Design a protein around this ligand. Structure first.
Ligand SMILES: [Ca+2]
Ligand SMILES: [Zn+2]
Ligand SMILES: [Zn+2]
Lengths: 192, 624
């Protein structure tokens, strides 16, 4: 499992379904088979979905994940009672796969802003891209591109621009970031 | 265009381009009668450029000649051996000093104090204690003198070398000689301690307003008798306080002459004096006959100071006359016509062509306080520093709120103690790139792009490659505190606005306007005025944006009013812009408004409030 970096917006955009589920009783990874022959191993979670964000209606009842962390370990806890929004690949009837590689975080991690982007925010900037800045110095050409440089500020995924940012789409077809609950304006002016 | 060069009567002004570099490289770099031996040899100008920031190109006649054109100490930068003993340190801790000579530009009380303040600069950081004596030889003989003053090291007329002092030793060891042809002041222009009227004790307040015209030197306007009066505050029409300006031709002090004016000439023992002398005196006090034969009639009074409208030149102080013709054109203001050194003169009759009577319009002068400070260190053994913010730096730089520099504290304490009966100076001079730097303000002031800090500004026009500096911010703006914050200049009136602490300054034409520096309350913002973060103008809206905290502000640079209920947070127009940006700048054309925070900037597009270009401050601007 070698997962590439992305902004928590793309998640809610590239992901089929996003919801906060939890593990009641793990659907003990059962049988399978493959090339070498031997059975396919797959972790399975019994889940309780609070609410759904995006995705198809056939609500998730159990989560599934590749055998070993080595390949993509989304080992999460049961009993405990922590929540996880994890927007894995939606599979028919409550089936959804979580690859360690997927946007997956305990409910408590996200900020007051990150959660509220679930209903409308993030969902407004999908017709938009989110460039990741290689090295100071970096640039953006297209009118729809938004410069994302956490590698610069905070090497890790979780960083200012991810914790509080969302690259919306302008009324001209172009795009740009934000912070707050007020989308309606260009530049502060007065009647002259 | 083909700018005419003239010789003014009294001034001897050849020195063309290099010509000077020749006379000005051996004074502080040892290289006599011969045109420096840089021909088959290469040394001289090099070490000159070592000092003063290393723009080592060679003779660099384009940028370097402007540095030997700045007012400096009379002391050499190299070879400490110039007569003062090898060991530069007083063998004592109780050091006497005596004021032998004074200067007409200042009343002897001001001079007396001016010095004593200088010494204190050193005492406050040393077990050294200076006590003035009025008789016999002391450790420091303080005097003023002109070219050829008696020690073999001549001064050069007005401007140029300001003074000089020998390092600790015998007799001449430690003496401090200040240049008499200079205009000594407390730093900000001519000073005149008023004599009569309703404010007998005060200093003339120049400028001052009377009859709707600003006066910067004593005047006889109003009067009919010819006397000199100056107002004792800015607004005469409101305050009404003033006094008369001292002048031996007008009156005198004490003695037995009852205020009567000097008589010229006046005979004293086979010599006829045409001005006051100190002949016969050791308190260094100018005196004079009030009758034509001092001996016979024995009538006299003192001459504690002389007021003057004009300086230098050949008009003995005569006020300017406007308009005046020179080379065929009339001038109604001081000019630099005929001058190549930029100095500003005017005519003392309506026509220079016919009369050749001129003078210098008095500039800011030099602070006896400061000049003596540096000097005194020399006398305590100290040697010329290479640190722009160091008092013991050769070039003169007027700082209202002067503080010894660590560099100084260091050097002086290194020789002597620190504080009898643990603190330090604090900050040091920031280095270009070497270390991380969060500037106090970046700004487009004129054409140059200044970078700010504690007491320093680096700046440049277009070169991103490498700015210049460091230079004391007080070079251009003295009344500015030792750590400014946001700063901008209104392209609608070309006024340099400086924010700092609870107040703000607004310079225009190298001078702050009456009333400023006001707090930010009367500026526009609420009492939040504790401090600011950044500010600038729009490249398309042409307004001011005062960023402070999580919330930005607005100002009418096109009107006096204010916009409806700000503060509103960045929640509206600004986008990527982070909380509290260190600075904001808009350059010529482009439409980009760079925002500064941390160690990197964020390019903003005015044409479209969105974003762009995230870059490394150090690598992009501020050349590394
Ligand atoms: Ca001089
Ligand atoms: Zn010096
Ligand atoms: Zn001397």
């Amino acid at each position: 499992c070698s997962c590439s970096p992305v902004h928590p917006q793309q998640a809610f955009c590239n992901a089929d379904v996003v919801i906060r589920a939890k593990a009641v009783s793990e659907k003990e990874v059962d049988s399978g088979n493959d090339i070498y022959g031997n059975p396919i191993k797959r972790i399975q979670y019994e889940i309780k979905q609070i609410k759904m964000f995006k995705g198809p209606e056939k609500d998730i009842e159990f989560i599934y994940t590749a055998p070993s962390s080595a390949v993509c370990g989304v080992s999460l806890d049961v009993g405990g009672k922590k929540e996880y929004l994890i927007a894995g690949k939606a599979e028919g009837d409550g089936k959804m796969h979580i690859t360690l590689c997927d946007f997956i975080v305990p409910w408590d991690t996200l900020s007051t802003t990150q959660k509220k982007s679930l209903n409308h925010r993030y969902q407004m900037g999908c017709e938009c891209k989110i460039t990741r800045c290689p090295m100071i110095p970096c640039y953006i050409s297209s009118p729809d591109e938004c410069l994302w440089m956490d590698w610069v500020t905070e090497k890790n995924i979780n960083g200012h621009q991810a914790k509080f940012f969302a690259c919306i789409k302008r009324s001209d077809g172009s795009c740009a970031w934000y912070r707050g609950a007020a989308p309606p304006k260009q530049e502060f002016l007065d009647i002259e | 265009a083909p700018s005419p060069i003239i010789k003014f009567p009294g001034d001897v002004a050849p020195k063309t381009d290099k010509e000077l570099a020749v006379q000005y490289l051996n004074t502080f770099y040892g290289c006599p009668k011969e045109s420096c031996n840089l021909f088959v040899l290469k040394d001289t100008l090099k070490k000159m450029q070592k000092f003063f920031g290393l723009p080592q190109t060679g003779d660099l006649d384009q940028n370097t000649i402007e540095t030997m054109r700045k007012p400096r100490c009379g002391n050499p930068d190299v070879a400490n051996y110039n007569f003062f003993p090898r060991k530069p340190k007083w063998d004592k801790n109780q050091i006497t000093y005596r004021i032998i000579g004074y200067t007409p530009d200042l009343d002897p009380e001001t001079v007396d104090d001016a010095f004593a303040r200088a010494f204190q600069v050193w005492s406050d950081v040393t077990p050294l204690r200076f006590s003035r004596i009025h008789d016999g030889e002391a450790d420091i003989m303080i005097n003023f003198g002109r070219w050829e003053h008696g020690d073999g090291y001549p001064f050069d007329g007005k401007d140029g070398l300001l003074a000089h002092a020998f390092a600790p030793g015998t007799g001449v060891g430690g003496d401090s000689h200040f240049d008499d042809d200079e205009l000594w002041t407390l730093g900000e222009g001519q000073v005149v301690r008023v004599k009569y009227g309703n404010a007998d004790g005060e200093y003339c307040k120049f400028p001052f307003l009377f009859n709707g015209k600003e006066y910067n030197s004593c005047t006889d306007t109003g009067r009919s008798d010819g006397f000199l009066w100056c107002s004792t505050t800015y607004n005469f029409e409101k305050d009404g306080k003033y006094g008369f300006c001292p002048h031996e031709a007008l009156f005198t002090m004490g003695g037995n002459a009852e205020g009567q004016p000097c008589k010229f000439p006046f005979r004293f023992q086979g010599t006829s004096y045409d001005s006051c002398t100190t002949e016969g005196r050791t308190d260094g006090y100018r005196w004079c006959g009030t009758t034509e034969d001092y001996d016979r009639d024995k009538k006299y009074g003192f001459c504690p100071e002389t007021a003057m409208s004009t300086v230098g030149g050949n008009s003995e102080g005569a006020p300017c006359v406007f308009p005046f013709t020179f080379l065929g054109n009339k001038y109604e203001s001081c000019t630099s016509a005929g001058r190549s050194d930029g100095k500003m003169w005017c005519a003392t009759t309506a026509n220079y062509d016919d009369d050749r009577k001129w003078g210098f319009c008095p500039d800011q002068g030099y602070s006896l306080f400061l000049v003596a400070a540096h000097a005194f260190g020399h006398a305590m053994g100290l040697e010329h520093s290479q640190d722009p913010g160091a008092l013991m730096a050769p070039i003169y730089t007027y700082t209202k709120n002067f503080r010894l520099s660590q560099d100084d504290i260091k050097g002086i304490q290194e020789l002597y103690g620190a504080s009898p009966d643990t603190p330090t100076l604090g900050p040091v001079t920031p280095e270009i790139c070497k270390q991380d730097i969060v500037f106090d303000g970046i700004a487009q002031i004129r054409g140059e792009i200044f970078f700010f800090k504690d007491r320093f500004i680096w700046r440049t026009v277009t070169p991103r490659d490498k700015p210049m500096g460091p230079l004391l911010v007080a070079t251009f703006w003295p009344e500015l505190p030792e750590k400014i914050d946001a700063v901008y200049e209104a392209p609608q009136e070309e006024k340099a606005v400086f924010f700092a602490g609870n107040e703000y300054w607004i310079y225009s034409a190298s001078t702050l306007e009456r009333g400023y520096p006001k707090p930010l309350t009367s500026l526009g913002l609420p009492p939040d005025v504790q401090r600011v973060d950044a500010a600038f103008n729009w490249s398309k809206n042409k307004k001011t944006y005062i960023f402070a905290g999580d919330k930005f502000w607005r100002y009418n640079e096109v009107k006096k009013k204010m916009d409806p209920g700000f503060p509103k947070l960045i929640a509206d127009a600004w986008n990527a812009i982070p909380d509290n940006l260190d600075a904001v700048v808009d350059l010529q054309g482009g439409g980009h408004s760079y925002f500064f925070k941390g160690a990197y900037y964020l390019k903003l597009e005015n044409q479209s409030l969105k974003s762009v270009k995230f870059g490394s401050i150090k690598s992009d601007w501020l050349g590394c």
